[PDB]
Amino acid sequence: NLQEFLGGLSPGVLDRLYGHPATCLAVFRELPSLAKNWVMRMLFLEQPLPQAAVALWVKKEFSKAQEESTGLLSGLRIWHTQLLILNPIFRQNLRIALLGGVPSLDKYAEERWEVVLHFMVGSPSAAVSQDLAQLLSQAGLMKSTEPGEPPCITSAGFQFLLLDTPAQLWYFMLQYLQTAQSRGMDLVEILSFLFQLSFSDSLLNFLQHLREFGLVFQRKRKSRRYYPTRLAINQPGFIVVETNYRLYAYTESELQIALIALFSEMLYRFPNMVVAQVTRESVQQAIASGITAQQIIHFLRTRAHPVMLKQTPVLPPTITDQIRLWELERDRLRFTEGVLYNQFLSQVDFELLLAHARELGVLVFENSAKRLMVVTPAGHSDVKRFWKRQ
């Protein structure tokens, strides 16, 4: 979530990030329940107040909401104890933020995002952009290893593929910001733009990437003015599931068919429908690539045709149960690297070593009855050093 992103920031960047136009406002909406109220109260005060008052301003019931709110904002450093007055810059900026101082676009966003996913999968026809490809490759969801050959899709790529568009997009932008620092792009400048949306060289390049993801569209040959799409600020289902592992999806976009084929065998493709079967071969194939049963059930659930919405649960139990079982069988044999011990002359030394391993966390499994245990190779040096030291 966005809260996780802002939480992991230094005080120095935070106040700089608290730009006048929006950041003081965008971070405000994040404040879940109570911090909003407390923020306004101490918005016209130039005198810090004792910490006891804040604690006793929430009734005994629901007192937990108070602690979480105060802890959440302390990390955001909106105020300082000064002994709880707010940051003068934020106070000033916020006061300036408080009385002081389309149909085609979504289709473009829908279309532009769809083609990106087409390129993400092994689609022979897709939009070509060297900057986009390398960005995804360094995004952690793709690896090429050979510039001449088109890059393949890593295990993380499939999991990302089956995610819903909001979570899919939001995570995608999350990696962009982390990679923005690595490439040298200032994080604060680019970040502030996203907040301003919901109301320089880097900016033009950053906007160009945003325009590439389909969030924005200049529409005037790359003019200064931009009209953000719906996805910039931040649908009925179609798949019908039977009880015999048969899927009838009313899909015309090749993306949906490609996604379904990832974990099912396609049988027929009608102009407004397609028939697929969820057989062991397909599901384990998807599980082998890296997917887990949760995404498929969620993916099938989210794209659920209205016909099956009446029945509760929406997905028939057998289909859900069978999918979960198929993944479980794959990981019946759980492999864990380790080093075994043998020939313990005395159990006291074995017990002492066990306590040492437990303290360091090196131990992975122990057997008191057989007087043996297993240690990962990383801890093998530590225990080996301990054995040498005697």
Binding site: A293, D321, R324, L328
Partner: peptide, 15 residues
Amino acid sequence: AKERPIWLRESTVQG
């Protein structure tokens, strides 16, 4: 009365 068994009412799979 005459209610269905637990192992049939809900999935017994560890998921």
